[PDB]
Structure formats: C-alpha cells, structure tokens
C-alpha cells in the first residue's frame, strides 16, 4: 500500500482511506500524517452507454428522459455476486401459519369474486328484466358487461366450470345475453350458499387452530432457547465471556475493576428467588433427605451472608475459585432474568387489567377454547406473583410445559423469553452447588469465606499458596451501599 | 400534527386479484385494508375516490412500449407461447401470470396519477394510495417480485407543481428502481431503509449516494435482521431531520411498505405500531405536500393492523385497537386488537454502527446544499357502501 | 501443435472472461477498432522492417485465409452465451437493409485473439499436414509477438462506466436476462 | 382441541386445494339444444430446446450460427449442423484447387458445418497458467468464489485452531458481552485471505455473506485503483515453471508500476523494504519541495 503511491498510482483521497481505516485507535499517528500530507460508483448500479431507449414516438413525448434514467440501471443477480437469493430463517410454525394464513385468504377471495360478480350479474338482471322482451332479444354488448373490469367474469367463469367451456359460455353471454342468465344466476348463487354454509364452521376451524399456533409463531428466541442454555450454560463459555471482559481494557489502546455489571438495586428478589428454591428443593427427588436438610441451611445461611437480607421467614473483597465464581454468576443471571420482569412489571399489568373483550366477539362464539380457561389468567392478581406461583406448579409437575410457555409469552406478551427455562436454570443451580459439599476444596474456600466476611495482604497469599498451582481465581468486590458488587478475573499473574 | 386533508384512491378491482398460490405478495391486503378503514367511521374527515384504469399512451410514460404492450397482451393461455418477454422481464419465472394483470398495472398506475394529480390541483394537502405501491419494477422490469413501478410514475406527474421530491422507503425490499430512475438529478431525493442481506431488489449500499447532478442526493441506510423502536426512532429522526434541514423539498412520497413488521414470509424487521407510526408522523410533523402510497405486506393482519392505524393517525384522531364486526371479524389475531405485537428477537443493530453511520452520512451531505396531463378525471364512487354490519 | 500464447495475452483473454462472465460486459458492436484496421495495419507496418524474398506472399495468404476464417467459425466457437442474442440482432439489423451478412467487420481484436487461442482444439483432430503446421505456428508466433508490442494501444485498460472508449458496453437486465435464458 | 382431521367439508374445496366437484358436472341450458437430454452439447446449460430425431441431443434456440427466434418456427423440422451431412477420391482434393488464396486455411475452412456450434471455452494451457483461475461449475470466471440468540458470537469469537481470540484490528475489543445482557455482544467476520479479525461496526457491513464472491478485507491492494485515466488490473501469478522470475537488480526509481514481492513478457520483480522506505522518503522531500 505505501509503495502504490509512489509509483503514482495510488490517489491521494484514496491513500488516506487506507490510512484512517488502517490505524485509527491512536490519533497522534493522524497528526503526525497531517503535519506533512498536504491535507456513486457502487458495487452495482453501473452505466449502460447505448442501452434500448430513447423511443419518442409511442405516446411518450415529453418528461420521459428528464429526471429518468436508462443508462445507470442494476439487477438482483449482479449486487447479489450471481449467488441466488437467501431466504428467511423460519420453522414448522411460521411456514404453517403462512399456509392457513394464505388459504383462508384463497376462500376469503374466491368467495368475495363469487359476490362481485353475482352482484353486477344481479344488476344485469334487474336492469333486462324492469322493460319488454324486443329489446332483450337483441342485446349486442361489448366485452365488460357495462362495469370497468374486463375479465374478472371470466376469471370467474372459468374457476366454477370447466377450461374449455368457459371460453364458450363467456362467448355466449357475451352474444347471447337474457338466454342463459337465470341459470348462470341460480348455479353461481347456489354455489356461494355451499361455499358459505362451508366457511361458517371452516372460518371456526382455521381461527381455533390460530389461536394456538399463533402465539408460538411469534415467538423467535424461545424456540431454541433449550438447546441455547445447553451448549452456552458451560464452563469454558463462562470463562470466555470474562476473558474476552477482561481483555477490553487492556494496554495498546489496566483497570482494577474487570466489571462493572450486575447491579443489584433490590432486595426482593432474594425473598421469592428462597421461596422458588425452598419448593424445588422439598420437591427433588434424586436427593437425600439429610441432604436436602445441608442444602437447604447451606443456602440459607450464604444468602444470609453475602447480602443485607435479615431472614425474616421462608471495603470487603472475596475471592473465589471456578466453582464458586460460576455459583454467583448464575446467581446473577437468575436475578437479571427475575429483574427483567420485574423492571417492566407495570404497564403489563396495567394493559392486562385494564384488557377488555370487544362485545361483537361475545355473539358467534368467538372465545378461545382449551388454550387458556384452567385459571392460568393473570387478571385480577399480580402479574409477578401469579407467574411465580406458576413456575412453582410447573416444578411441581401437574402442569405441562407447554402451557407454561404460552401463559409465559400471552400474558407479558413475548417479554419473558428468559423464563422459559427457569426450572432448569435453577435445577442446574441446584446440582451445580451439590459440588460444593462433594469436594473438599471448595468446602474450605466456602469456610474462608465466612471467616473473611464478618468484620487485606494475607488474602492474596493464602487464596495463591494452598491449591494446586495452574488453576482458575477470580475475584469479587461486595461494596457496603448501592450492592453494586464487581468481579475481577486474575490468574497465573501473581506468582 | 397540524390539520391536513386526506385523500385516499381505492378501486375494488384491486382486492380481487390473486397472483397466485403460494403466493406471499398479494393484492388481498388491499381490500381488507379499505374494509377496515370503512368500518372505522373514519368517513367523516375523508373522501372516497376512484382509480381510472391507466390510459396506454400515458402509461408508457416510465415504461417501454414493448413492454407495456406486453402486459397489456399477457395471460395465462398463451404465456408459453410469450417466452422471450416473459424471460427477458422476470414475468413468469418469479411472478406467474393471471387473470387481469393488465388491469392491475392499469388501476394502480391510475391511482398513483390520481394521487399526484391531487397534489398537483392542491385540493387535498395528503393523498394516500393503497391500491398502488408497486415499487421494485423499473423501466423494462418485473424484478423485485413486483410488476410496476407506479410511485416513479406518480413522481414525476407531480414534478411540475413539486419541483424538489422526496421520497422515503421504510419496508426491507426497498425501492431498486425508485432510486435508479432518479439517480443522475437532484430533482428527486430518493431515500430508502432496508437490510444488507439479500432481498429482492437485491441493490442498496452506503456509497451509491448518487452520480452527476444527483450525486450525494439518494441516500440509502443498511440496517440488520431487525431494529428495535428506540433504535429505529434514533436512526430515522436525525437523518430525516438533516435531510428536511438542508435539502429543502417541497414533497414528501412515503412507502407504507408492511413487509417491515413483526412477522411475515420474507420480512425481517421488529417494529410495533409505534415503530411504524413514527416514520409516517414524523414526515407529517413538517406540513409540507404529502403522498402516502403502501405496497408491502406479505401477512394480511399485520399490514392491515398497520394500515389501519396510518389512516387513523393521519386524520389527528385517536385509533382504537377494538375491530369493529366486518367481513373479515374472524382473522386478525385469537384477541382481536389492532395491535402488532413486536416479537423476542434480537436486536442486531448496534449503537456505534448507527453512529459510525450517522457521522459517515453527515459527513457526505455536509458538501451539498399524452392527451391526459396534470388531470384529476375521475369519480367519487360513493354513492353505494357496501357496509356488512349484518351476519 | 500448441502455439506460444504470451503470459500478457493470456491475462489480456482471461480479463475478458472475467468480463464476459462475471462482470457480464460485451464488447462494443461498433467497435472502433476491427479485424480490418489491425491486418491494414499489420501490412502497413510489417512490410518495410524485413526484406522481400516472397514472404509477403503466404504472409498475405494467411492473412486472407485468417479473414475467411473469422467469418464462418465466429459462430460456431465464439459468442460466449451472453453474446448470442447481440449476433442475432446485429444479423437482424443487417438484413434489414438488405445488406450480406459478413460479420468479420463487426468484432474487434478481443474475438481475434480468442480464434488464435482456439486453434489447438480443433487443429489436432483433422488429417492436417505438420509441414505447413510448423510454419504457420512460426508465423502465428510472430503474430502475437506483434500484438505484445501492440497491446497497450489495441487491448488499453478502462472500463465502461465514466468513458465510452473502453471497447466495451455492460449489459443490461433485460439483455442478461434473456441471453442466458435461451 | 383442535381436532382438524374430523372436519373436511368434502362437498366443495378441500386443502387450498380444489377438487374435480366444479368439472364434476356438464349440464348447461345455455345453447338451449341450438430424445432429449436436461444439458446441452454447445453450452452444458439447461433450457428450452428443440426435439431431434437424427441425434439424441438437445440445442437451444439462440444457440445456433443461424440463430432463429423459438415464437417463429422453422419449416418443417430443424436439424444440427453436423446432422445435415449425417445421412450423406475425396472432396478435400478438389476443394483445396476450387478456391484460390485461402490454400493453408482450406482444410480449416472445410471443417465448419460438420459440426456443431458451441460457447467458447478457454484451452487446457491458458486457465492453469494463473493458479488463482479455476473452471466454473457452468463456465464461471473462479477466483475467490466459492435469528437466533447470542450463541453466534461464541461461534465467531472461537475458531478452535489454538484456542485463543481473535481481536479486531480498528479496535482492540473483541466484545464477547455476557450471557446476561448480550446487546453488548458484536459479531465479528473474519477474513478469507488473512484472517483478520474484524467488527462489523468498524466496517460498514451489517450481514454475513456466504454464497459468491467472498468477503475481502479492506487491508489489501486495491484491485481497480483510478487516478484520461489507469485502470491497473495487476499482472496475476504465474506457476507454470516458475515463469514469473524474480529479478532484483535495480530497486532504484524502478518505476515497476505496483505488483511487488517484498522480501525482507510478465516479470514480477523482487523489491526490499529499504528500497521502499528511501523512494518513500525522496517522494515525501519532493512533495515537499513542490
């Protein structure tokens, strides 16, 4: 690229683009370039110099050529690099909401069509019928029957009979009209009543089916949202996201802060989030008793612990290994996904209570059936508290996930995509801190931490000097207001 | 904003054309559309109007005659026989042919000239135009999944009362042949939303602003596989600001594409109503002549939801979601309310790439600165209502 | 039996590939320069720089065979898929004046050097005698030894977007449309 | 409860689709009783053809030397170009003496309609020259052709070839984000020639494109630079016996108009980096100067 220019062929605009988007991060190099520099045609859409225009003399006599254009045009295929066309990711329930949408659109027009045209046929018949029959003999019309359309009775025509006898009985009611016409009448008017009686259970039907599938379509992230948790709820995924965290604020542009995430800005959230463990755990059943019992007090007495909660009913830095790390970052993932309902909790239930059924719906049987009518409304209670009373059933498994997932997206409406998997998040919670108790390593760090918490050179040396040396630590900061609490990743640079 | 008077062209030929099965584009919408519009009550501050099929000669004031005399000649029975031209101008391959092809092209451009002749005379401060919005087409082209360009038609019959046209593209699919035919002028400012990926124009890039007396003059945006509302409001009120601060036109063509909402065949953007709304009321908030046309939609509910709500907004009055009973009561959504619901996908678009954008498109605006013509023949075409409140 | 097409000259045929294919250009039908003007002046040039023993003889005599050659099998080796359509229409517009159809005028030195790289094909698959395959190989060298000379002013580097003497015209949507159609 | 299967309305329309119920009935009281293959031999493509009896292959219409518009038919049937001397001393001798001037060109001349006409495609000694050329699948020029949640980026953030991570070049930001809040998670593109790591906020790109030409990154020579004026569209690489050469000799005001291989008929000459930094430097003093 330096060379380019000083073979003079590279310009200057040209060299300075380079330049500016070569390095950029740093601008005493731009100023060291401006002390002593000196200082459209698109991928497509590209010129035609003799293309097939310029034809004044079909009608198009003036302001054809003015602002127009002929000669600067382009095609799909060219911008497209002759690559066909991508088209857009779906699944089975969009591309079958897209099939009912579009054959009760087939009838809706087939049966509007059928009632244009018995209409302009009925003024047709009127206006022969309201005088004598000398002039009904002779009634030679050109094609179009009077109205500005010139082919939908033919359209028609050739959809209710046969190919080739429509373009004789169009033929013969174009030259032989008031011979044919009441029959055509009875036959075309016969048909919209059996296609009528038809669509008053088919239109039933196919807005019954909707009314479940719909929902679902709408939904584009909570469809793969459990194989998501399975591939990214892993270890190595939790120790990248930090390392490329802490990697952002390195030199060539540290800090010692590596995040400044996880904000904690309620208290509640421990209250419910107990109460949601409390439950899961009194109804696991792979677990001991006894254990049960440890888990339980262990959980207690930690959330107790770290935060400023009391346990009303059912500078200080810690650092931390892999395990216990990877604990308080699910831990915050759960209170973020918690607070994402919560921070939007108002206007939802404000728009859910002041919701009202339109009274036109209430006459032909137009409710929902077997979607939502067990109680699984959120009307009338808190939105919050009925969706974890929700979840709580959905753990206690006499209700089925699917209509967990429907409730989750109708009544917040495809707003809570991240509780959709709130059972196994904290069932992964739940057997990922059973590690804590299975080993004894981190029984020991767990006992460091308690010692450390109530009321710092030597903690650098005995959280380093008591493990094996080439293992993860990490680094958490708990502040005494706000709960802004901020976790620094060090490893193998203290040594 | 301020009081403005509406016009709004409908044809009921327009809503019983079927391109085809399978087929997501589609003049269905139209119809519904206008059914929806009055069953509202919304006649009271409007009037109804008629499209005249587009006469021949002036038809082929964008087009080829070939081409025109084509379509006029086209139908299913002798298509096969029509290789060449259906080849030649994607028309058959991509998009089938059908019963009354020629009279859809000639109702449409026929409302586009109607609507421009309406901005022509000055009666009416705003035309609205859904019948039409045929808008990938270009001279001797069906591409981009369409078979008009009746919007360039229609801007170029009100170049003579409008000398500065401004045009906005706000659906994916956007506008190939509205910002090719006005490339090399000044005249008209074509600007266009739509995402980088492959589509059916296929066109749109950041650098193609323009070339001669047009140059810096079309703007185009790329944007991602979805936009947030805020995002979207933050990428369309500082553009469309600068551009009503320094190019100075005196109207305003809004495409009421649909293809832009929650959910539809080839569509891939996220805005709710709100999101939809902002981009026609924010063209509106300026008072300037205004011409609102609608071609997109791939999903009836969605397009007609948003259809509804622009014919309710752009009359300064307050659109309720409740739908009242027509023929089609039994087909927008199990709760029956005029409401798009925005969907839990991501939002790809960052804040720094809108930025890296916004300095870039600054950066480049900051250097600039036929017997039948002008007519408005038509008819009223509301002497009958064909209200269905009985069922 | 394979001549020595120079390196430059198979870059100069794979640029027009590139431009024929994907870049989808043409080459200009009213090219300003034809396989006329390039033999006019090859005897206008190569006359006077050697003595005269008779080889100007078979020198013309190729050239004349070179002529007839260009004629018939342009349509049958040329006209990559994208050109089909603009050799009928130049046929059109040629019979409608009633004029012969004698294409060789038409294409410029672009089709010239693709008939030269396309002997070998063809040449070995017919009962052709190698005495006189050796000394047209040696004269078709020299041929393309004059073209390298003649390269920059015959085959120069532009294209068709900001001028219209880069010998060639891009095509457009209908035309690519219906070229690679049929 | 659905239940879709119990109700069909076999009566009329069924499935978007119809049924034969509409050609079912035919009483009216209105006249009131009064071989060939998918490819092709001249282009290898697929597409209209016409039916052939004396040969078991296809042509298109527009494929001919006598190219024919397919609305307009021939008389009769048409036949290929070698297919009219199919059902028909030698006439080479007589055919060399019949005409005069065309003598070394006569036996080339005869051989035209025996047979058929065909696209042209590159000999087997003038693609190969240039590596960085390939044949297409149907004739194409190859030179470098070929919504979900955040989990795209640990699939782009991670290649697995060393287990590190790749960092962008404009900004020394991978930006992974977190599982928690992943707006702040960028995709990042990397190159097909060098790997550069790359946002797609840094460059204006906003999409992946997998199908065509691949991606390049803005860190190389351009390709069609213009300074009435130059389009350099380099001199390619030659790997036919090491053809190139490399000559270094001069480096000095060598004027070799870009096409360098650094090193620490078509000549790819070698240049150095010393060599670049002192022209660079004498362009720099002149400019100044000027």
């Not at chain 1, 054959?103 to 206006?127: G, P």
Request: with cysteine; charged share 25%.
């Amino acid at each position: 690229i330096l060379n380019l220019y000083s073979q003079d062929i590279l310009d200057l605009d040209d060299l300075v683009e380079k330049v500016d988007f070569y390095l950029g991060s740093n601008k005493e190099l731009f100023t060291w370039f401006k002390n002593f520099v000196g200082y459209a045609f698109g991928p497509s859409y590209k010129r035609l110099p003799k293309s097939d225009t310029f034809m004044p003399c079909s009608g198009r006599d003036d302001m054809c050529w003015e602002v127009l254009n002929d000669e600067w045009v382009g095609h799909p295929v060219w911008a497209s690099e002759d690559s066909g066309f991508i088209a857009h990711r779906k699944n089975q329930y969009e591309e079958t909401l897209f099939k009912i949408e579009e054959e009760r659109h087939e009838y809706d027009f087939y049966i509007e069509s059928n009632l244009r045209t018995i209409q302009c046929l009925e003024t047709i018949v009127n206006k022969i019928e309201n005088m004598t029959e000398n002039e009904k003999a002779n009634f030679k019309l050109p094609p179009g029957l009077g109205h500005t359309s010139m082919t939908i009775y033919k359209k028609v025509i050739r959809k209710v009979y046969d190919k080739e006898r429509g373009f004789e009985i169009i033929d013969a009611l174009h030259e032989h009209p008031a011979v044919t016409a009441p029959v055509v009448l009875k036959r075309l008017k016969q048909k919209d009543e059996e296609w009528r009686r038809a669509q008053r259970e088919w239109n039933k039907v196919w807005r019954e089916l909707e009314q479940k599938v719909f929902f679902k379509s709408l939904d584009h992230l909570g469809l793969t949202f459990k194989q998501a948790d399975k591939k990214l709820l892993t270890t190595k995924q939790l120790i990248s996201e930090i390392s490329s965290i802490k990697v952002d604020q390195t030199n060539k542009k540290p800090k010692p802060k590596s995040q400044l995430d996880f904000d904690f800005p309620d208290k509640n959230i421990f209250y419910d989030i107990l109460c949601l463990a409390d439950t899961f755990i009194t109804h696991t059943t792979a677990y001991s008793n006894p254990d049960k019992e440890r888990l339980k007090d262990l959980l207690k007495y930690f959330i107790s612990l770290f935060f400023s909660i009391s346990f009303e009913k059912i500078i200080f830095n810690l650092f931390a290994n892999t395990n216990i790390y990877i604990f308080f970052r699910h831990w915050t993932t759960i209170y973020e996904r918690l607070l994402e309902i919560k921070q939007m909790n108002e206007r939802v239930t404000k728009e859910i209570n002041t919701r009202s059924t339109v009274t036109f719906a209430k006459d032909l049987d137009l409710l929902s059936s077997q979607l939502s009518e067990m109680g699984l409304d959120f009307v009338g209670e808190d939105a919050y508290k009925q969706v974890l009373r929700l979840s709580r059933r959905l753990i206690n498994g006499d209700l089925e996930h699917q209509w967990f997932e429907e409730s989750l997206r109708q009544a917040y409406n495809n707003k809570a995509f991240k509780l959709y998997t709130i059972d196994k998040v904290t069932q992964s919670l739940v057997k990922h801190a059973h590690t804590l108790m299975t080993d004894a390593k981190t029984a020991e760090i767990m006992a460091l931490f308690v010692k450390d918490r109530n009321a710092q050179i030597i903690y650098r040396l005995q959280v380093r000097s008591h493990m094996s040396n080439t293992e993860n630590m990490f680094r958490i900061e708990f502040d005494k207001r706000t709960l802004h609490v901020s976790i620094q990743y060090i490893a193998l640079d203290d040594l | 904003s301020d009081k403005r008077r509406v016009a709004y062209f409908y044809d009921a030929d327009v809503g019983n054309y079927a391109y085809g099965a399978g087929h997501p584009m589609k003049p269905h919408r139209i119809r519904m559309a206008h059914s929806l519009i009055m069953n509202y009550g919304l006649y009271k501050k409007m009037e109804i109007y008629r499209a005249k099929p587009a006469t021949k000669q002036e038809m082929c004031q964008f087009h080829t005659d070939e081409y025109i005399d084509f379509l006029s000649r086209v139908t299913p029975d002798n298509l096969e026989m029509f290789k060449r031209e259906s080849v030649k101008f994607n028309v058959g391959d991509d998009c089938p042919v059908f019963d009354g092809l020629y009279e859809y092209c000639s109702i449409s451009g026929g409302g586009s000239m109607e609507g421009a002749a309406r901005l022509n005379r000055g009666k009416c401060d705003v035309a609205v135009n859904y019948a039409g919005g045929l808008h990938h087409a270009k001279k001797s082209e069906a591409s981009g999944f369409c078979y008009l360009n009746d919007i360039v038609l229609g801007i170029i019959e009100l170049l003579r009362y409008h000398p500065r046209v401004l045009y906005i593209d706000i659906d994916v699919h956007h506008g190939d042949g509205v910002e090719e035919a006005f490339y090399t002028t000044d005249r008209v400012m074509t600007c266009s939303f739509h995402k980088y990926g492959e589509f059916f124009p296929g066109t749109g890039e950041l650098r193609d602003i323009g070339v001669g007396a047009g140059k810096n003059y079309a703007v185009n945006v790329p944007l991602r596989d979805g936009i947030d509302d805020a995002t979207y409001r933050s990428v369309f009120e500082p553009v469309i600001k600068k551009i009503m601060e320094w190019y100075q036109p005196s109207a305003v063509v809004l495409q009421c594409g649909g293809d832009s909402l929650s959910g539809d065949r080839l569509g891939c953007f996220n805005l709710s109503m709100e999101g939809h709304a902002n981009c026609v009321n924010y063209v509106k908030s300026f008072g300037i002549p205004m011409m609102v046309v609608g071609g997109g939609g791939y999903t009836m509910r969605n397009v007609a939801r948003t259809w509804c709500f622009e014919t309710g907004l752009l009359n300064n009055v307050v659109l309720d979601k409740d739908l009242p009973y027509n023929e089609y009561y039994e087909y927008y959504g199990p709760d029956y309310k005029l409401s798009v619901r925005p969907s839990n996908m991501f939002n790809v678009n960052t804040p720094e790439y809108l930025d890296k954008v916004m300095t870039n498109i600054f950066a480049n605006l900051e250097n600039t600165k036929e017997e039948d013509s002008a007519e408005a023949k038509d008819t009223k075409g509301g002497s009958q209502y064909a209200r269905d409140l009985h069922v | 039996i394979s001549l020595q097409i120079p390196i430059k000259l198979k870059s100069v045929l794979v640029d027009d590939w590139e431009y024929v294919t994907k870049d989808k250009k043409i080459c200009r039908l009213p090219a300003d320069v034809t396989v006329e003007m390039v033999l006019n002046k090859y005897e206008h040039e190569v006359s006077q720089e050697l003595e005269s023993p008779g080889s100007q003889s078979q020198l013309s005599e190729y050239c004349a065979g070179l002529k007839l050659y260009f004629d018939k099998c342009l349509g049958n080796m040329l006209l990559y898929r994208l050109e089909r359509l603009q050799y009928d229409e130049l046929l059109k517009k040629s019979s409608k004046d009633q004029k012969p159809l004698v294409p060789i005028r038409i294409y410029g030195a672009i089709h010239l050097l693709r008939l030269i790289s396309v002997l070998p094909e063809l040449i070995s698959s017919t009962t052709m005698d190698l005495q006189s395959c050796q000394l047209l190989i040696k004269q078709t060298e020299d041929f393309l030894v004059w073209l390298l000379m003649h390269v920059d002013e015959y085959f120069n580097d532009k294209d068709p977007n900001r001028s219209d003497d880069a010998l060639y015209v891009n095509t457009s949507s209908q035309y690519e449309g219906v070229a690679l159609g049929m | 409860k659905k239940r879709p299967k119990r109700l069909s309305s076999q009566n009329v329309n069924y499935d978007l689709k119809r049924r034969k119920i509409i050609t079912s009935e035919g009483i009216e009281r209105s006249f009131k009783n009064e071989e060939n293959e998918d490819f092709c031999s001249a282009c290898n493509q697929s597409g209209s053809f016409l039916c052939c009896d004396t040969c078991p292959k296809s042509f298109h219409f527009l494929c001919l030397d006598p190219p024919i518009d397919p609305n307009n038919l021939p008389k009769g049937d048409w036949h290929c170009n070698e297919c009219k001397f199919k059902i028909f001393k030698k006439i080479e001798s007589n055919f060399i003496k019949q005409n005069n001037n065309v003598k070394i060109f006569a036996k080339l001349l005869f051989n035209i309609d025996s047979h058929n006409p065909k696209q042209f495609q590159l000999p087997n000694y003038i693609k190969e020259t240039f590596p960085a050329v390939k044949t297409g699948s149907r004739g194409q020029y190859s030179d470098e052709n070929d919504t979900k949640l955040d989990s795209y980026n640990p699939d782009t953030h991670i290649d697995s070839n060393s287990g590190k991570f790749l960092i962008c070049y404009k900004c020394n930001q991978t930006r992974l984000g977190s599982w928690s809040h992943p707006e702040n998670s960028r995709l990042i593109m990397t190159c097909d020639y060098c790997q550069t790591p790359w946002h797609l906020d840094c460059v204006p790109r906003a999409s992946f494109k997998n199908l065509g030409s691949k991606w390049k990154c803005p860190l190389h020579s351009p390709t069609k630079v213009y300074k009435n004026y130059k389009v350099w569209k380099k001199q390619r690489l030659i790997n036919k016996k090491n053809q190139l050469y490399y000559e270094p000799l001069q480096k000095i005001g060598y004027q070799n108009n870009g096409n360098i291989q650094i090193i620490p008929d078509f000549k790819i000459t070698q240049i150095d980096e010393n060599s670049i930094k002192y022209d660079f430097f004498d362009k720099i003093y002149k400019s100044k100067m000027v």
